Curated annotation (Swiss-Prot):
GO terms for cellular component: cytoplasm; cytosol; endoplasmic reticulum; endoplasmic reticulum membrane; Golgi apparatus; Golgi membrane; membrane; nucleolus. Mg(2+) 1 binds at N163, D176. The gene is PKMYT1. Interacts with CDC2-CCNB1 complex. Can also interact with PIN1 when phosphorylated by CDC2-CCNB1. The active site is at D158. Its main location: endoplasmic reticulum. Belongs to the protein kinase superfamily. Ser/Thr protein kinase family. WEE1 subfamily. Residues 35-279 form the Protein kinase domain. Mg(2+) 2 binds at G178. Keywords: Acetylation, ATP-binding, Cell cycle, Endoplasmic reticulum, Golgi apparatus, Kinase, Magnesium, Membrane, Metal-binding, Nucleotide-binding, Phosphoprotein, Serine/threonine-protein kinase, Transferase. It catalyses: L-seryl-[protein] + ATP = O-phospho-L-seryl-[protein] + ADP + H(+); L-threonyl-[protein] + ATP = O-phospho-L-threonyl-[protein] + ADP + H(+). It comes from the Eukaryota. Negatively regulated by hyperphosphorylation during mitosis. The hyperphosphorylated form does not associate with CCNB1-CDC2 complexes. The PLK1 protein kinase may be required for mitotic phosphorylation. This is Membrane-associated tyrosine- and threonine-specific cdc2-inhibitory kinase.
């Protein structure tokens, strides 16, 4: 019968192909044999994400698998690129850790640490504007991740609440590196969080800082970001939406204006922001 194949990457927790509980004679997949499923964390075009307990160590992980088998070599390399992107990011407390990746029957599996609810789910639960206290914590933690990615010439290109996951004691970790590219390949991002210079084909680390600014503006004001049209242009002229920017502290607005600077040459970097007095330790 079919058998899994480890998708090799520097920094994996186990260079062994399988766990002792896996019997290659059974018709069940390595996923079904080496993991007790628990619940579905999310689904979509990207596949499905399950909360699992390993039938090997009983530890809690999150496993993502692709929906359909590989369409071809380009489709396979596109899906496998997310594993390589995790390998380039490496280990950082503010980045979702990749444990191991493999493929079986054309399906790609990625086993990561189990994180908390996404920043999107957390806002849906509270159903209102997140208090500014929590907003600074998530902003600092995400800037820490971006500063780590950008220091290696990596640009995430998909910073949004659905890709930020809550950690213990109010922390969070940047995630979903399926669109990350290394400067020196690029896929369609979300237009709601798209930096304005990406339409001009200017890809750089500054694009992530803009996406995080809209991410903060979305969670702190409980507003829906437009996909296009006039509302999309207004969030990219340098100023803030006066309607929703009310109730925000002047300290937060000034940081937002810096991140939302239209010209990427003049836009602050992740390290520049983390050195501001409002983002102390
Ligand atoms: C609603 O919650 C989630 C939705 C989607 N995905 C996850 C998820 C995860 C799984 C597999 C990966 F390769 C990941 N990369 N970045 C994050 C990844 C987790 N770890 C996690 O806790 N919740 C997730």
């Amino acid at each position: 019968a079919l058998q899994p194949r480890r998708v090799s990457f520097r920094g994996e927790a186990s260079e062994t192909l399988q766990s002792p509980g896996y019997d290659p004679s059974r018709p069940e997949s390595f996923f079904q044999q080496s993991f007790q499923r628990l619940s579905r964390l999310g689904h979509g075009s990207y596949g499905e994400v399950f909360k699992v307990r390993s039938k090997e160590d009983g530890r809690l992980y999150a496993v993502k698998r692709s929906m359909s088998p590989f369409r071809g070599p380009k489709d396979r390399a596109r899906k496998l690129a997310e594993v390589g992107s995790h390998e380039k990011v490496g280990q950082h407390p503010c980045c979702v850790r990749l444990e191991q990746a493999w493929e079986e029957g054309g399906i790609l599996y990625l086993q990561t640490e189990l994180c908390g609810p996404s920043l999107q789910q957390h806002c849906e639960a509270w159903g209102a504007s997140l208090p500014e206290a929590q907003v600074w914590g998530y902003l600092r933690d995400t800037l820490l991740a971006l500063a780590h990615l950008h220091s290696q010439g990596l640009v995430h290109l998909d910073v949004k609440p659905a890709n930020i996951f809550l950690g213990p004691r109010g922390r969070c970790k940047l995630g979903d590196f399926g669109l990350l590219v290394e400067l020196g390949e690029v896929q369609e991002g979300d237009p709601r969080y798209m930096a304005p210079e990406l339409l001009q084909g200017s890809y750089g680390t500054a694009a992530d800082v803009f996406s995080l600014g809209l991410t903060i503006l979305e969670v702190a004001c409980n507003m829906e970001l437009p996909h296009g049209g006039e509302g999309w242009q207004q969030l990219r002229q340098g100023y803030l939406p006066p309607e929703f920017t009310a109730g925000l502290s002047s300290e937060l607005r000034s940081v937002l204006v810096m991140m939302l600077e239209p010209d990427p040459k003049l836009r602050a970097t992740a390290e520049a922001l983390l050195a501001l007095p409002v983002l102390r330790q």
